[model samples]
Target: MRYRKGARDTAFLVLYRWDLRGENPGELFKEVVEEKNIKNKDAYEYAKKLVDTAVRHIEEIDSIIEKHLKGWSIDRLGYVERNALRLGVAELIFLKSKEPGRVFIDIVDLVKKYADEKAGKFVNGVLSAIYKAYITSSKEEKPSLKSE
Candidate 1:
């Protein structure tokens, strides 16, 4: 699949802002993606899904992430790593149509561009942990669309 650099940039900005500013990435995402005329439902879904998943599943997600990090605390993780995992886990747990392998590669590309080299490994490790532990723990194996 061809990379949509603009869309990816928009996604990252919205995700980063949600992490740092507690803003609604969903609304901002709609605005930005609309401006590009792509109007992809998936773009908005992805944006909101990432932030909402992080918020809804923070405790559990963090607990899982913490388990993988060994010595690292959530606070100790780099912002890029934290946000990357947040987005990745959201997609993994919530975006059912997204293939696990594809999402992993997307995250790796994002990290290679925006995050430091070390951050990529951490992001991958945490995502792998979550996928193995949490993804398969559920019978549904897909994100619940019902507003929880």
Candidate 2:
């Protein structure tokens, strides 16, 4: 309620709307903020930036998913499962909005809340792999971050 969950939840809802309706993330984020009656400017600000960056890197993100997916296509994913990854991967790989572990756990928890235990496990595996690479890959050129 006070920190990143606002951004996470807002981003999740915005991503959900964008995916289902095939709408622009740009305007959708703004509209979502207003429609949701969010009180924290900072949270919505972060969420908007998070959603926009994720949308920008959507192709890149999905390719990462496609490569890591277990016998699945991005198109084959469900809304909650797919967008949760989008939001998580956006934050973990791109946004780095919080401590990497927090971002990872939050999305895994989100998937479990909205989807199923199996979906959470799948997301958990996916993020574990992604973050493992993210932490060790000098190829990315971003200095690896350490979380508490």
Candidate 3:
């Protein structure tokens, strides 16, 4: 896989394991990467950053997801959808490393691969809604970015 593409998949893998097994991001990240035999040295930094961003800012990210969930409850969101949204929101609202639109577009691709067609559409809606609201107005209490 391409380096950045590799990072996103590995990041998603780390969070997916964390969600199911409820482990801290760093511990679970090593386990998942070891299991998956990840070897892209260039990808590791950003992968960890992405994972750290979501886990640390999860309370805020989850609220953003819940608020835009319409009648849907956060509890009922499947693992793929929920975590994919977290990754998207992590990059979208918190990371700000990429252009705003790339966040969801790439996340949608991941959902289509990890979940299903409907899963992609569902995340697309939620992510798009969050982006719309954010474009209208936003926040600056970033806590996950490093001095990279």
**Predicted model with the maximum TM-score:** 3
Model 3: worst 10 consecutive residues (lDDT sum): 69-78
The better-scoring model by TM-score among 2 and 3 is 3
53-94 per-residue lDDT for model 3 (tens digits): 777678787777766777676556567877777777777757
TM-score of each: 0.63, 0.73, 0.81
Each candidate: RMSD = 7.5, 7.4, 7.2
Candidate 3 global Cα RMSD: 7.2
Which ranking of candidates, highest TM-score first? 3, 2, 1
User: CA lDDT of 94 in candidate 3?
Assistant: 78
Candidate 1 Cα outliers beyond 4 Å, as residue runs: 1-9, 27-59, 135-148
**Could you arrange the candidates by lDDT from highest to lowest?**
3, 2, 1
How many clashes in candidate 3?
0
Supply the TM-score for candidate 2: 0.73
Instruction: Please list the residue runs of candidate 2 whose C-alpha ends up more than 4 Å from where it truly belongs after superposition.
Output: 75-77, 96-99, 132-148
